[PDB]
Design a protein around this ligand. Structure first.
Ligand SMILES: Nc1ncnc2c1ncn2[C@@H]1O[C@H](COP(=O)(O)OP(=O)(O)NP(=O)(O)O)[C@@H](O)[C@H]1O
Ligand SMILES: Nc1ncnc2c1ncn2[C@@H]1O[C@H](COP(=O)(O)OP(=O)(O)NP(=O)(O)O)[C@@H](O)[C@H]1O
Ligand SMILES: O=C(NOC[C@H](O)CO)c1ccc(F)c(F)c1Nc1ccc(I)cc1F
Ligand SMILES: [Mg+2]
Lengths: 308, 276
């Protein structure tokens, strides 16, 4: 699984630190500040001084399905890879589900994007590598797909790592909560929107649409006006109908290399049959380039936002 | 409204156990001597217009009485606190009733239940009241008798972020006119409910009488929104498993993409009559 040594030694350190903190209850945690809402808050755990992140979601429903949810989520203890956020534990408290996970110093690429304004091509290559590796790990090891890929669920630390949060491990939690929400943007593939059976193909599309947004600093649909692009009020159904019935976004041709332009074009093919899978994407020209490059990520991150 | 303004003689009504929350306050069981259902609302708005329109709707509901519409009894408003008192329905919701193993539906029982609902809706429409929330969970079945609840109620402007959260069961009953206008920060009161939108929701209840399930399996709400508002999803489901031509004719009529081509409830009585 192309598992590097420095990576395997930081996985071991956190797995053995995992049992050091052990099991839990409620009053072990203490608030720090507002990470944001879609709620997750920065937290201090008092048995082990390490600070973790606790996400609370409000679900009053029948306790029988509540117990099914907790037991399905414990599979996250088996999910451990250098490209997926460190998971600590899951418990029910006060009819408020809490997930305790790694704290990521730099937050979400959504936050990154607002402070950074735009993301350079050189570095988008590395995040793209991480996602395809994570998704094959996920599809191969436990046979699941993510179902909710977007910038606010990609997290970065000053340690220079990249990992993804909020992937779809529990089916019950999806049918009982996750489905009911609709935001102001949509990252859903065109074949999911028409309700056919979808696969990780749908996830490839999400990654592609997310990459456009970060590369130009603007949510890409509907496409920016022609003069607006050089310088750099719509209801939700008109958004969805554009995605299904109009051409897909594309990167601007003057600024980015072919390999980048071609990578996203293959991710954004409407027909998931012709869209690249992960095997094809891992051997793509753009991937071979960035994997072999030399970027110091930690430096970029800390000078973008002001950490150390 | 001090509840002494209503034709039902009132000395005292006592709250009982709660029986479910929702976007529109909390509904308790209560004893008027008979049992009743009491919905407690609160008006954030606190604006004279909201209570003026509330007063308008609750006075209109006073004028209603029909064996297929739940009996509206009283309403009192000590602002910001409000309460709506209706007759308590013994028996099971039609929703939980078709989903029972033991239950025996047939080509006849379905048509009878459907004609009951239409008489209730037909009355309500004649008096110019739009339900705005017809669905399987707001119709009650106790032995022979069928009662519609929770009508008119979407017109009010009481307490309910910059996201939206839409249950799947509700979306299935919503006509395309409505879901195209949905968008965060838009209240339910601004949506285009109507008599046609009510007959579309009757379309979904009739499908539920045939198939004892949603016409669309639980899925992401964005998916449902596209499929509902494009009309594609309802056209595809009509393809996928068929029932009977005469049965399906009323379904296709009610779900008609252009709202103006949808039948009235009086007409729907005739169509349901000329059946097996
Ligand atoms: N483990 C985490 N570490 C740091 N920040 C986090 C973490 N999890 C979530 N956040 C932040 O929480 C905020 C909201 O994330 P989230 O709870 O996933 O809701 P959302 O992404 O905005 N919408 P949705 O994905 O549909 O729930 C963002 O600003 C994230 O950066
Ligand atoms: N008149 C009534 N008689 C008996 N049960 C009722 C009556 N009105 C409402 N209920 C029940 O009270 C509960 C809550 O009703 P309601 O507030 O209408 O929620 P809902 O229809 O499921 N969705 P929502 O309208 O958004 O709250 C449900 O179990 C209803 O079946
Ligand atoms: O996080 C999830 N959704 O975010 C949406 C918000 O809850 C809406 O407010 C989510 C969805 C499905 C699922 F199966 C999960 F396990 C989820 N949580 C979740 C899963 C793995 C890790 I490592 C960390 C996590 F947090
Ligand atoms: Mg209701």
């Amino acid at each position: 699984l192309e598992l590097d040594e420095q990576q395997r030694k930081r996985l071991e350190a956190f797995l053995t630190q995992k049992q050091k903190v052990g099991e839990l209850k409620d009053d072990d945690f203490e608030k720090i500040s507002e990470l944001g809402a879609g709620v997750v808050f920065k937290v201090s755990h008092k048995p082990s001084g390490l600070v973790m992140a606790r996400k609370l979601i409000h679900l009053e429903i029948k306790p029988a399905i509540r117990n099914q949810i907790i037991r399905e989520l414990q599979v996250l203890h088996e999910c451990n890879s250098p490209y997926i956020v460190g998971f600590y534990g899951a418990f029910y408290s006060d009819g408020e589900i809490s997930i305790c996970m790694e704290h990521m110093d730099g937050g979400s690429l959504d936050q990154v994007l607002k402070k950074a304004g735009r993301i350079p091509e050189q570095i988008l290559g590395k995040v793209s590598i991480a996602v395809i590796k994570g998704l094959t790990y996920l599809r191969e090891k436990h046979k699941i797909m993510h179902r909710d890929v977007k910038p606010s669920n990609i997290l970065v630390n000053s340690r220079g790592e990249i990992k993804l949060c909020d992937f779809g491990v529990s089916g019950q939690l999806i049918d009982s909560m996750a489905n009911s929400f609709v935001g102001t943007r949509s990252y859903m593939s065109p074949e999911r929107l028409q309700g056919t059976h979808y696969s990780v193909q749908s996830d490839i599309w999400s990654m592609g649409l997310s990459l456009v947004e970060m590369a130009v600093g603007r949510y890409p649909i509907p496409p920016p006006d022609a003069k607006e692009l050089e310088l750099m009020p719509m209801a939700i159904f008109e958004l969805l109908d554009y995605i299904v019935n109009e051409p897909p976004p594309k990167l601007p041709s003057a600024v980015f290399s072919l390999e980048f332009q071609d990578f996203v074009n293959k991710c954004l093919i409407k027909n998931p049959a012709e869209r690249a899978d992960l095997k094809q994407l891992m051997v793509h020209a753009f991937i071979k380039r960035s994997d072999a490059e030399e970027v110091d990520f930690a430096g970029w991150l800390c000078s973008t936002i002001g950490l150390n | 409204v001090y509840l002494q303004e209503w034709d039902i003689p009132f000395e005292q009504v006592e709250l009982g156990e709660p029986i479910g929350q929702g976007r529109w306050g909390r509904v308790h069981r209560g004893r008027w001597h008979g049992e009743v259902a009491i919905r407690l609302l609160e008006m954030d708005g606190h604006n004279q217009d909201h209570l003026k329109l509330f007063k308008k709707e609750v006075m209109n509901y006073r004028q209603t009485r029909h064996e297929n519409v739940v009996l509206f009894m009283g309403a009192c408003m000590n602002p910001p606190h409000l309460a709506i008192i209706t007759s308590f329905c013994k028996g099971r919701t039609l929703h939980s009733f078709v989903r029972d193993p033991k239950t025996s539906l047939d080509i006849n029982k379905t048509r009878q239940i459907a004609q009951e609902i239409i008489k209730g809706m037909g009355y309500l429409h004649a008096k110019g009241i739009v339900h705005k929330d017809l669905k399987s969970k707001n119709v009650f079945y106790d032995n022979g008798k069928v009662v519609i609840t929770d009508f008119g109620l979407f017109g009010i402007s009481g307490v309910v972020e910059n996201q939206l959260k839409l249950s799947h069961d509700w979306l299935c009953y919503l006509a395309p006119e409505i879901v195209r206008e949905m968008t965060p920060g838009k209240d339910e009161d601004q949506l285009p409910f109507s008599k046609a939108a009510d007959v579309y929701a009757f379309g979904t209840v009739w499908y539920e009488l045939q198939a004892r399930d949603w016409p669309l399996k639980n899925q992401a709400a964005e998916a449902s929104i596209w499929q509902i508002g494009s009309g594609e999803g309802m056209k595809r489901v009509l393809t996928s498993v068929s029932l009977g031509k005469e049965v399906s004719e009323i379904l296709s009529a009610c779900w008609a993409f252009d709202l103006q081509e949808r039948p009235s409830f009086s007409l729907l009585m005739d169509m349901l009559e000329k059946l097996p």
